[PDB]
Amino acid sequence: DGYSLGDIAVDWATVRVVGGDTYSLNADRWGTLWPAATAIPFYKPIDGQRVITYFNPLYDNYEGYDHAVKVEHNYNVLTKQVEDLTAENESEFGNDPVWVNKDMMWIGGGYLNVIFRQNLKHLVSLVRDMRATAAEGEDDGYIHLELRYKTYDDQANGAVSFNLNSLDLTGKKGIKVKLNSVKDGETEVVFNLK
Amino acid sequence: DGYSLGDIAVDWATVRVVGGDTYSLNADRWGTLWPAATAIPFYKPIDGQRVITYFNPLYDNYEGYDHAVKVEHNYNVLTKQVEDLTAENESEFGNDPVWVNKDMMWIGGGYLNVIFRQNLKHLVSLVRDMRATAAEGEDDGYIHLELRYKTYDDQANGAVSFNLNSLDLTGKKGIKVKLNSVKDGETEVVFNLK
């Protein structure tokens, strides 16, 4: 391609472990990234860990990988599943009013990616009401999830990635995510799929 | 805050020119950024230019700015308005089937931000049908836009930012954006606002 050695790029990715301490990154937009070089040789990879990865792209189609790069930073992102909300845990997740305009939420690489302002004592969850009462998805064609934030002893920050591959999107128009906005109360966000 | 000199961060931002070659960045998530230092002293700022900015955060609440930082890179992003589609220009914008899963679109800092895979001979537009026939927004409460891509002499790449402040969101549920997907044909994307 047209790359320079000075150039930097970023993406969110999933770490794939090759052999002991050798790893590749499966990036949402850039695809698979082989670390031909690195500024962090003592980085300990965990299979399935989501990260924000900063890297200098070098080549394309390198030994079965979409790109070879020099990794500069791998900031670990909290990696979680969609959790079923039941009678047993209905009160466990909280619902603090937390969302502002500088928060950002999107679907990439099979995950719901969330960043509250910056990555630089709380519980953040993505839940699905499976209780007897919940017939909301029934009669609209969307999967209904809710993002829940909870504080302990008192301004939200951080980043999280929720694996969405536990859901069945067959005959579904998409996914809906309910947010508790600080100013606007409960609001909906609609993700049409395909 | 808890920053290191080794740390890097990224955001999308709007350049604000202070005096000749001195500038600040108005970042979608991080807020206003003062360049206390830089790795690009010969960078020529243009007021209103949108950029992807890479920077090392240093301080908070520095002289009226939300942060002081060292700027590392400012990759210029194509910056455009929402264009009214009329009888005069109906055929001017094209509609190539272009969208894939590795493309990404979101609203940040008053702009519709689009990146086709990577920033590393085409026309990309965000248009609004103002022709006599268009009564689609009438009777659903959303503003209806369409993202249009066009090639000349034959795989989409790049990044663009569309200013949305020309639109009136009063009594509106949000904005809808129509995409031409390669696999799925015309598809809708829904942005609920507030």
Domains defined along chain B, listed by start = 1-76 (2.40.50.500), 77-194 (2.60.40.2370)
Q: Strand order of the sheet with strand B185-192?
A: B83-85, B122-129, B142-151, B174-181, B185-192
What SS3 class is residue B169? coil
Tell me how the structure was determined: X-ray
**Residue B137 to residue B155: CA distance in whole angstroms:** 32
The C-alpha atoms of residue B190 and residue A36 are separated, in whole angstroms, by: 40
Residues of B in contact with A117 (CB under 8 A): 29-30
Q: How does strand B65-81 pair with strand B158-163?
A: parallel
CA-angle at B142, arms to B136 and B146, nearest 5° = 70
Contact call for residues A94 and A149 (beta carbons, < 8 A): yes
What b/e sequence results for A99-108 when a residue is b if at least 16 CB atoms lie within 10 Å of its CB, and e otherwise?
bebbbbbbbb
Cα–Cα separations (whole angstroms), residue B140 to A131, A138, B136, B171: 32, 22, 7, 11
| Binding-site residues on chain B for chain A (CB distance < 8 A) | 1-3, 7-10, 28-31, 54, 57, 72-73, 102-104, 106, 108, 115, 117-120, 181, 183-184, 187-190, 192, 194
Handedness of CA B37, B43, B47, B48 (dihedral sign): negative
Please state, in angstroms and rounded to a whole number, the distance separating the CA atoms of residues A5 and B120. 12
- Among residues B52, B40, B47, the alpha carbon closest in space to that of B19 is found at B47
Query: Three-state SS for A44?
Result: coil
Q: Residue B95: what are its φ and ψ, rounded to 5°?
A: -160, 60
Q: d(Cα A8, Cα A25) in Å, to the nearest integer?
A: 16
Closest listed residue to residue A145, CA positions, set A115, A188, A185, A108: A188
DSSP characters over B180-192: EETTTEEEEEEEE
Q: Which one of B26, B102, B155 would you mutate to disrupt binding with A, by most A Cβ within 10 Å of its Cβ? A: B102
- The backbone torsions φ and ψ at residue B8, rounded to the nearest 5 degrees and listed phi first, read -120, 150
Q: Does B72 sit within 8 Å of A29, measured CB to CB?
A: no
Cβ-Cβ contacts under 8 Å for A20 (sequence gap 6 or more): none
Contact A98, A105 (CB under 8 A): no
Q: Considering only CA atoms, which of A79, A65, A86, A90 is closest in space to residue A130?
A: A86
Which residues are paired to A6 by β-bridges? none
Bridge partners (DSSP) of residue B79 are: B161
CA neighbor of A55 nearest in space, from A89, A5, A125: A5
Calculate Rg over the CA atoms of chain A: 19
